[PDB]
């Protein structure tokens, strides 16, 4: 049968990629057309070669790709990159997660920024964009999940068609919560709750609501994994992020609103200090808490620390 | 019937946009896919919800969009922007214009730069482009009108199919004259004639040839409305204009011809003085004469004056 | 018949282009949609109006165009530019080449960089790209020829369908050798052999292997013809080349490899000296040897010399 032929199959990347894709700080490279295969490979090692029907999976992937836009940062490359970080987390904590969670989170990551225009929730609200009237909170993130559901509903795109209805609902819910958790405004409270549950020892992965929070922190960690690459990758990626933000700052000014320094290209010279603030207030606490909860994710924190040092070095003029 | 269903319909933008689209200095925003709806809205308020069949109008709009190119300034966004300025002029002088003129000028504005390559008539002539052999004067502008007619002639694209033949010819002529008037080389003589007719009192909107001239000056004013936005929008848009011109300067140099300072990127430092020259010699006289003729268009002149002050401030180093 | 109608036909460019396209330093201009006609014109003057069936030729051209990518330098414009330099070489040495060679080399030039991603053979090897496993030497160049063959094999795309099988094989071999010769790593040995054969007088165009070498040097000369344009064109084109190389340098750094100064954007200030090195070590010897062998190609060498002077002038700060 078809599932039988698919069971005999092997999927394989070039040698260097098979070796280094297991590393947390792996970079997926500049060859766009290699990215779908990289993702299929990760799905097959982490989930199994029979979790998805291959023809369907590829059809789904190319449609997701088609629904990312050509913006400097929140693009198709970002999606696959975030998916890779989740792959590495899953592979290094491989006894903790169910099959549904594995399938779900990899898919959630690939879809997490679908149809991103390169603008924040804040700008949409101030512009008075139609999405802001429809989604009062987590505006873009609820749109990404809506986009995800639209793609699944396309003919020949339901990659979960083999699941029972009960499992289907579960996986879609895993996906929904995970995408919503990528709204950074929700991170601060989430990490705060996790830290306190961790310290007192109430934190228990057998409790669904705790488990949801931990997955949420995982999504933040993957979403921000730019700060966990080696310095040359981290510093170049920063160019892409500010290209987007500065464009939003321009648009704020066009609405007659002074944008914050983060989004203001007139404040370029103060980027290094702005990054330092970001690492101190957001990234280091993020990966510190995640390392506490999932000790094998420690390389993310180490790498984050190294980049913090590099930015300090920039500030000094060193 | 269909026209009856269309008569019950309402079209509406978000709240902020409904309010501020009436302002002369409105910016249509960075969300491209909102622009067609903005244009339909303007057509419905200024012309009426029964002037066009909606399905046809949208088909026409998307084809026009498809025939603008991806250049930094003379693009789809410019077209809708010029259309908005005409909307605001029409709404604030609402007793003067016929239905045909209203329909026509909004359509003319949307189509005024169709298939623009980002090069002036001058460069085409020097390059010896095939369009220059076909159109000895107003080369690009006669091409834009030809493009307009080709799109109308497409199946299901004749948005004026409900007009009588006599009215159809009239509207196409209104459109033709209006697009040709956007050739800035023709502006100088036109404004000169209008000024003198205005001063002596011979100017009379009941005279078709005077009326054509006034519409022509209206088209110039809309075409240049960049200089009538608030400073943050005006100054950022200037980036886009020079990106185009400097590219043309590069191409002049490749033909072995020294380009004028306007088109020469080696003269960046002298942009502020170049703008000052432009406002003094072209923009201020343009909106001054237009305000004389159509007093409600005065906010364009005020805004132009404010930007003139801003450029003086740049020159001073202030 | 159809070939008879095609025989009555004339193809013609605007006046300026008919005159200046015969010049070695001709620039094909910024109007993309003029480029196919320019190429057809060159084929018709150099080969004859009956060498190709026009409908087929155009179909082929647009498919080739479709298979070039949107990179800063190794793009569709580069392909037509390299084809033009071969045109000028062929027209000024018009008694030396067969019909097959003329057809072949113009086609080879148009296809020489098909599907170029903007990365060197070196980077592919270090990235461990699948093409590097398939093609151990001249990696990109064997890919360009493979792409060429795929396009020919498309229905209605075999522009050589009128040739006998024997002639078809010959032309494809001419094309294959010519594209492989564009691998610059092979140039150094090739020019070295040609120089020595030239000096001793063993060089003989009636010897197929010598003839192949001379064609190979011709391909290098066309491939590098950027350095043979007038200074304004040469200096602007240099921008495009470094945009590509610096991007590759970035990607080297992401692999953890320090790129050479040629590919490193941190070494911008040293570009003028880097060009000087390039002209001394590669370009001047290239066109010097070619001028020895084919004296009518002397204007390429003159122009190269003038650009060498310009770069020296840049270095001096003059
Ligand atoms: C969500 O915001 C961010 N995501 C990032 C991923 C990688 C690197 N940076 C990221 N940022 C980001 C966070 C904070 C800032 N802050 C500032 C503040 C002032 C100035 C002048 C610059 N940056 C910027 C980016
Ligand atoms: C039609 O030309 C222009 N349209 C504009 C719209 C907005 C802003 N500027 C516009 N320009 C324009 C007009 C004149 C100049 N002149 C110069 C001259 C010298 C230099 C160094 C720079 N600009 C430029 C743009
Ligand atoms: C194949 O390499 C090149 N092709 C060119 C075509 C036109 C102009 N330049 C070309 N180059 C090229 C050759 C050598 C260099 N070398 C360096 C070395 C150091 C530095 C700092 C800059 N350039 C660059 C381009
Ligand atoms: Zn997001
Ligand atoms: Zn994201
Ligand atoms: Zn125009
Ligand atoms: Zn215009
Ligand atoms: Zn090549
Ligand atoms: Zn090449």
């Amino acid at each position: 049968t078809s599932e039988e032929w698919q069971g005999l199959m092997q999927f394989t990347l070039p040698v260097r990629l098979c070796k280094e894709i297991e590393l947390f700080h792996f970079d997926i490279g500049p060859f766009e057309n290699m990215w779908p295969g990289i993702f299929v490979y990760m799905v097959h090692r982490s989930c199994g070669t029979s979790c998805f029907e291959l023809e369907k999976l590829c059809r789904f992937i190319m449609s997701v790709k088609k629904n990312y836009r050509r913006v400097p940062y929140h693009n198709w490359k970002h999606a696959v990159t975030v998916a890779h970080c989740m792959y590495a987390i899953l592979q290094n904590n491989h006894t903790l997660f169910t099959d549904l969670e594995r399938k779900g989170l990899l898919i959630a990551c690939l879809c997490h920024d679908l149809d991103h225009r390169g603008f924040s929730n804040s700008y949409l609200q101030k512009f008075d964009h139609p999405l802001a009237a429809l989604y009062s909170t987590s505006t873009m993130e609820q749109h990404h999940f809506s986009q995800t559901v639209s793609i699944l509903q396309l003919e020949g795109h339901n990659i979960f068609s083999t699941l029972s209805s009960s499992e289907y609902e579960q996986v879609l819910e895993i996906i929904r919560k995970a995408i919503i958790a990528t709204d950074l405004a929700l991170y601060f409270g989430n990490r705060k709750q996790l830290e306190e549950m961790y310290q007192t020892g109430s934190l228990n992965l057998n409790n669904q609501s705790h488990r949801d929070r931990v997955i949420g922190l995982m999504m933040t960690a993957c979403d921000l994994c730019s700060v966990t690459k080696l310095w040359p990758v981290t510093k170049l990626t920063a160019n892409d992020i500010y290209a987007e933000f500065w464009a939003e700052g321009d648009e704020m000014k066009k609405l007659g609103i002074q944008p914050i320094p983060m989004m203001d290209r007139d404040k370029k010279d103060e980027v290094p200090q702005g990054q330092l603030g970001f690492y101190n207030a957001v990234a280091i606490p993020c990966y510190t808490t995640l390392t506490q909860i999932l000790p094998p994710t420690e390389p993310l924190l180490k790498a984050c620390r190294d980049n913090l040092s590099q930015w300090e070095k920039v500030i000094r003029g060193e």
Side-chain angles (χ1 to χ4, degrees), chain A:
Chain A
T1 75
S2 281
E3 73 174 7
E4 282 170 343
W5 267 105
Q6 224 179 253
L8 289 169
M9 263 175 29
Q10 281 94 63
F11 207 103
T12 191
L13 276 27
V15 173
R16 188 193 64 89
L17 277 70
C18 291
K19 182 179 173 64
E20 290 180 346
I21 190 169
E22 298 304 320
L23 297 173
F24 283 95
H25 59 272
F26 178 72
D27 181 80
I28 62 172
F31 303 104
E32 291 202 358
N33 303 310
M34 285 185 78
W35 302 338
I38 291 171
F39 179 79
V40 171
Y41 179 83
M42 295 189 292
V43 172
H44 287 168
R45 285 182 63 82
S46 63
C47 300
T49 48
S50 306
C51 282
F52 291 114
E53 198 275 285
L54 185 61
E55 184 170 59
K56 258 190 162 156
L57 178 51
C58 292
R59 190 179 294 117
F60 179 80
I61 292 168
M62 300 306 295
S63 284
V64 175
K65 172 189 203 279
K66 186 189 162 283
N67 282 272
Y68 275 85
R69 300 194 180 182
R70 294 198 264 254
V71 290
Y73 180 76
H74 289 99
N75 53 44
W76 176 230
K77 189 174 190 169
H78 177 61
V80 178
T81 296
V82 171
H84 169 271
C85 190
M86 181 63 74
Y87 170 78
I89 292 174
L90 295 177
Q91 293 296 93
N92 288 280
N93 294 278
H94 193 270
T95 64
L96 304 183
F97 299 101
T98 61
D99 283 339
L100 293 177
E101 288 170 341
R102 295 197 282 238
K103 283 173 196 178
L105 295 176
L106 291 176
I107 295 300
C109 285
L110 196 70
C111 298
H112 95 271
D113 273 334
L114 271 167
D115 195 39
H116 207 292
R117 301 137 159 78
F119 300 107
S120 69
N121 289 335
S122 176
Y123 175 76
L124 270 64
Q125 193 280 309
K126 292 179 183 299
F127 185 83
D128 194 1
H129 190 279
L131 290 171
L134 184 66
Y135 299 128
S136 64
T137 62
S138 297
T139 300
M140 289 303 297
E141 294 82 12
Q142 313 202 12
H143 180 61
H144 308 305
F145 175 70
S146 178
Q147 288 290 106
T148 298
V149 174
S150 292
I151 292 171
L152 289 168
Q153 286 174 5
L154 295 174
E155 184 183 7
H157 286 72
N158 188 349
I159 57 177
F160 303 115
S161 65
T162 275
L163 302 184
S164 69
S165 173
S166 177
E167 287 174 328
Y168 180 92
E169 297 298 319
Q170 289 175 59
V171 73
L172 263 290
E173 194 67 356
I174 291 175
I175 294 170
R176 183 184 64 79
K177 293 171 182 172
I179 290 173
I180 301 303
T182 71
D183 177 11
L184 194 59
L186 298 177
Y187 152 81
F188 297 96
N190 191 55
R191 191 218 61 101
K192 188 167 178 287
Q193 293 302 307
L194 288 173
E195 181 70 19
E196 165 83 351
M197 290 180 282
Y198 170 76
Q199 291 300 328
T200 59
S202 63
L203 184 61
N204 187 329
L205 291 174
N206 293 283
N207 177 332
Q208 188 60 53
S209 65
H210 295 180
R211 191 177 185 83
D212 290 344
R213 291 188 179 278
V214 172
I215 289 168
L217 181 66
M218 283 164 61
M219 292 298 293
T220 305
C222 296
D223 196 15
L224 299 178
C225 66
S226 171
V227 301
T228 62
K229 305 302 180 184
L230 299 184
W231 175 245
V233 175
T234 296
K235 183 62 163 62
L236 289 170
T237 301
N239 295 338
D240 293 341
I241 293 109
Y242 286 107
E244 266 190 38
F245 292 178
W246 292 336
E248 171 168 346
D250 293 346
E251 292 302 325
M252 288 291 285
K253 294 174 184 174
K254 293 178 184 176
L255 292 177
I257 304 174
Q258 171 65 33
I260 62 172
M262 173 175 70
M263 318 301 280
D264 193 345
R265 73 176 71 253
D266 291 345
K267 307 300 184 183
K268 284 187 176 71
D269 290 343
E270 297 164 61
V271 165
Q273 185 59 253
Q275 287 291 310
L276 177 62
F278 181 54
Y279 278 65
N280 290 329
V282 178
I284 297 294
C286 175
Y287 296 105
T288 300
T289 300
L290 182 65
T291 294
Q292 286 168 341
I293 299 165
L294 305 175
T297 66
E298 196 192 346
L300 295 173
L301 173 60
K302 179 182 181 291
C304 185
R305 284 174 174 164
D306 289 342
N307 281 327
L308 174 59
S309 298
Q310 291 298 331
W311 286 106
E312 288 174 346
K313 185 183 171 67
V314 173
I315 294 176
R316 289 199 303 277
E318 178 184 340

